[model samples]
Target chain A: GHMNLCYIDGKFLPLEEAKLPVTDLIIQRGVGVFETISTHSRRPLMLTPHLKRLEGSATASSIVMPATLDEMARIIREGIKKMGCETMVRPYITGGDSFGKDHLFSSSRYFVIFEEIRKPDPILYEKGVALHPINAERYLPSTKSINYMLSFTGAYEILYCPEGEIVEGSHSTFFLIKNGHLITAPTSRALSGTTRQIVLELARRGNIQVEERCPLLTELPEAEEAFITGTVKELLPVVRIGDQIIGNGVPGKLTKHLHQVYLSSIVEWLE
Target chain B: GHMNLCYIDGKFLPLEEAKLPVTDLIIQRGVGVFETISTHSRRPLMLTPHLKRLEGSATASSIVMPATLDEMARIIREGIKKMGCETMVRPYITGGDSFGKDHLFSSSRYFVIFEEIRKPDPILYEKGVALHPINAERYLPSTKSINYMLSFTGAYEILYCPEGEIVEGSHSTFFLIKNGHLITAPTSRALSGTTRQIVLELARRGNIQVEERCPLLTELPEAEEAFITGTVKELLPVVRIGDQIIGNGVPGKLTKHLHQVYLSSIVEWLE
Candidate 1:
């Protein structure tokens, strides 16, 4: 569970030594994309989807990734195996510094770091967490760029709701349960979280109707329940948004059921 | 000129060795601020204004800067002295990493990097560069956050003009000349660039009327001229925006005069 060897620019080194140049575009311009996949028993969960998303982000940003998907997978597997425990695998690709005539990153650098996986407190599911609606827009919401300025304000988790309509969370996908329907925003205005995709599939398999649309901030008070899904948060119920409480302000029944379903699916997902 | 020795976390080292951890919050979340100040005869130009802006950015982001302004000034002076030549001095501070309970950066890291100063091409002033207006918004426009996602698309520099009104450049301040008056967007929707502040002062001293308002994309064709100012670009003219040309697609007379006045002021300012 301690720091393990990490993969950086095709080299395996101690995690402490995994450093990037100060001039790297990630630091200079925040031009980078990353995916954090949780591992179960030393196996990365939903890695293909993560890698696919990372590749899509790089392509969208016009960054040429230094490694192929297969090379990245091998490095991830090697790093995970070296840790030999449950871990959080973070694979990030940065548009390296501009070295050519144009002021664009001519090359890219990829790194994979291993950290001990830390699950959300079960109490959060019981009591739920509060969401603060922020009127802002995320740059390239579909791409998981390093720019997370809108995601957090100190200790509070911020929701990117430019108008009265809710777009998504700073670091997660948001969902609303209203009139027995599971509603969430489309990927056009928000990040298409891997966990959010699987959760939608789970809803269909469980015979719950899914609706993709922008959830309005005014609808939260009348909604039966709400929750956020991400790689780390998994399925965290949102009891309160700002000063408005959802339903009766406690974790809703469906939210708890989906939490269990997601945990159960992870076992099958890793295999 | 090439890169020289730089300062990182209170340590003086070669610029190539200035590196940060992969887990640093700057890379993880892009939560950081930076300021680039040019030098005149090995002395940092407008050091007070640059550091004041940097401090304002840290305060806006609620990031606890690691060093005082005095300490930063000393570091910058030392780095510039070590370079022994005119340089572009970039002092950046980043929220280190998420630790403890809050999921925010527990500490901050500061760095200063020196690079050979490159001035804008005289041909660019004669011909002017093109501006491609992009419909986007920068997160925390007031703070000079490392996020520059909307600034460039490949080799092209993009102008963030949400709702057809140009806010600013990806890395510089923007201006439009119309009817013998100077105009630019207010800092509320863009970064308050150090170069921009001085440009306005020069305009006032030269008896030019200055207006602070967002410039519409549709107004570029009717504009007399256009230009961008930054640490590196200084006062470079813009002749074309997309397909529209400004004032016969050549630098304006006033823009050239202003550039000359700015250069003259630098000599007195540096003294």
Candidate 2:
């Protein structure tokens, strides 16, 4: 429920003491990127992919990475060891201090924040969750940038659907099942979610049919199952999106199976 | 070339000393809004419009304005008075101290930064500037949100043209002349810039015909003249847009005349 320490600018400081100068474009212009890697039993899950995405995000935003992947892993490991508990390790970097409007980031500041993992309530998975569809599209949907204002629109989960096309969830990768085929929008239309890749792999490994297509808002009623995947959420079942009740207003068999397998994969690798 | 003081968290501190907690959504999620107002002879041009747009941005982004328009204007006036010269006053606010992903903002932080105004080189205004066309669209285009990563593409000016239709410049409003008509995209397709509104008013007062339609990329060759308007760059002529010379590849007579009138209006009001 609380964080004690965070690593920022090469120093481990108390969470309350971590501060960023207002001159940094991260605060001035929201010019930064982030990667949130969840730790289970003091073991980070898929640290390499998370780090790679972080670097890619920085490159796209014109912010140079402050440290190498190996160094980042070492620092995150120290944070886990320091906390002595499973935590959500969010390593975010910015273009340091802004000297001009042309994005002259004179330096770069990378901070690793360790916070308690916020897992979905068990009843959510039992009954599945509801999603509110919002008519919006992200500017840079593929980059893990800090432009997430519309993602939290007074809903447990907000789906980004522009012109009736479900692009993706605000904070997670969306998936649905129709006739036993797992379907989702490709990364070209949404963020390349780390958990999304794992779910795709698991579907292929389980011999489940997979299709890379985004389901329409009108198609929710036809879905046999619906769910979202993310590093933190793992796999969450969705029983409803907007007014559409997905598959009898309850979690489907395939969704439960995927959730179980997704959870098991966490231990299958992390433990 | 430097900033001496900045107002933050209800106090006026030196620019280098201003700081915000890293937990703020501005840094964590890039959830913030800003309005940069330029000064002339120590008087801010169109301060009310800037403040209104800042409030409008806050309304769109779900961040409450920390101060009223009157208070904001007073604060900005004080900032200008303290600086003892003309400057760019950027008052920005954020959803302060993010506690959870559901955006439970504990409080809010507002800051007023005073930086030296950077005018485009006089030669660029005489010779005209070239704009590089880019394929990018902003999320919440009307809101002055800090989601401007794509807006900065290492160019003097980058025009956001999606599907070959010009939207707006990264930081300024785009305008062109054809058949003696002053034409530009409406606020529906871009930000309602203060200077843009002023230019529109100026055009009407000068008995110039006005059209509120965006020009296509293919129409640049047909343009009799082109220019950009903003608080900082009051009016900059565009000699070319992406290798297409505009009006014999020089600042047009109408552009120079408007620029002269625009400069006159500044001194007409301030002095």
Candidate 3:
């Protein structure tokens, strides 16, 4: 395990020593917003998009960021430099301690931590992974709040749905390849994942049609293929959803191509 | 301000020194369960019911408790004894740092904090307070998870509704006093407040009729009276909701009677 440095409020501290008050809304009521970005050779990949989403999530959750975007970016950079390696950066803004009558806070706290990136297994992309359609709903689907009580439960990565309509994964955006077009739940119904947005753009550039409406859970069995996208996982092929084997239980050609395109784009961003 | 002693796992510490790991799921993802119990003359009121609900909540969220009920009870008693006063005890169980594949923790952490009991304003029960309806929903209404992100926001106490049906208040169980009967949304749609349960039991014993069904927002205007119940605010009246005045803009006779009965019951428990 790598011991990295973390930036909290204005001061930098050891990652292990960075503690949050137990009374903070983030701990008391799970009231906070956060974003994670992967690094490429010490350069934060897709920094602009991640920052945009982070700001949007904070606004949606009413969490006041202690720093402006420029200030947070500098702090994150400082944390990464102290870590001195390629890492995953996680920036969180918490609703302060005085979450009173209106859930308002006199002040807010911001922290960024740089940690060794946990690379996804190559076999997951080549052989694909399994998904389970869990019948659940997120309180605010668009905000990246720290309220993931239903997302994961003992080896299960839950894909939340209401009334059997596939919405999104706990920490990822889901996509289905039907015929030759790509389909995913609308941003209004699920998180507007940053990597998902990039994958959609890559699909359009490849002349593949895309639909943002939610695909029915029943459609998974008949779909040509399915996959999920996130910051760390990038693009991961889904071989099965529940007992349904999606598209011969293998990664679809379109999914593989899109993952390659996404990797290439990251390379360009690092350069 | 009073400095209180708190219990974390097996260690006793100052309340101000109670810190949670920044990486704990309770802070990282708002993944934890909590129960708050009010005390009367150093004895916890309705202790059994609160513990039952806490255990149920932990099971609902798949959080493994660090201690059994007896062990937790002893810890809470110790914390209360150290405080040496009537207090509000908040016991929290967090999914520890190792949030793994399914968001499961290798072990759980439990802590109890004591604070001076905040008694409700007498005028609030006499004149009642106004409530504003906010369009929101809880992810898991039954589980007392630390996910209250959409509940309150700066001078507002929100009552969440889905599809225009009044479900529950942000931090309390809502009741409608219509034609001398008691109406509330079923436990399926709310947190099943312990105080709400006690009030219901008292109402039945007092020969008051009760209905457990979802009420439409459109029905609020026609309601004779309304009130909200929670662990601390036992049976406070609601004189208005938004722009609609409830029952001549005053606490209803039935609500006042119920409040008196509830207080008498607590007196018996303390004796």
State which candidate has the highest DockQ: 1
lDDT (tens digit, per residue) of candidate 2 on B1-271: 3356788767878899998888788888778889888888888887877888898888777676667888878788888888877798899878877535545443768889998788888998888898889866666788887766766523467898877888898888999899889889888898988788878888899999998987899988889999998888888999888888898888888888888888887754341
Misplaced by over 4 Å in model 2 are A98-106, B1-3, B99-106, B267-271
- Chain B TM-scores, listed for every candidate in order, come to 0.94, 0.93, 0.93
Q: Give per-residue CA lDDT, model 3, range A209-267, as digits (tens).
A: 99998898888877999889988898889988888889988898888888888888776
Worst 10 residues of 2 chain A by lDDT: A97-106
Whole-model lDDT per candidate: 0.82, 0.82, 0.80
Model 2 lDDT per residue over A1-271, tens place: 3556779878989888998888887887677889989977779998888989998888777787778888999998888887877689989888777535545554778888888788888888788888889877666676798777767423467898887988788788999899889989878889999899888888989999998987888887778989988888888888888878898888889888888888777765462
Clashing pairs in 1: none
**Residue-by-residue lDDT tens digits, candidate 3, B1-271:** 2567668747888888888767677888777888988887688877777888888888777787778998888887777777787788899988877765554465778788788888778777777888787666676688788777876431125777677787788878889988678989898888878888888889999999999987777887788888888877888888877777787899888888888888788755431
| Model 1 TM-score on a 0 to 1 scale | 0.95
Give me the runs in candidate 1 sitting further than 4 Å from their true place: A99-104, A154-156, B1-3, B99-106, B154-156
Write the number of the candidate with greater lDDT, choosing between 2 and 3.
Answer: 2
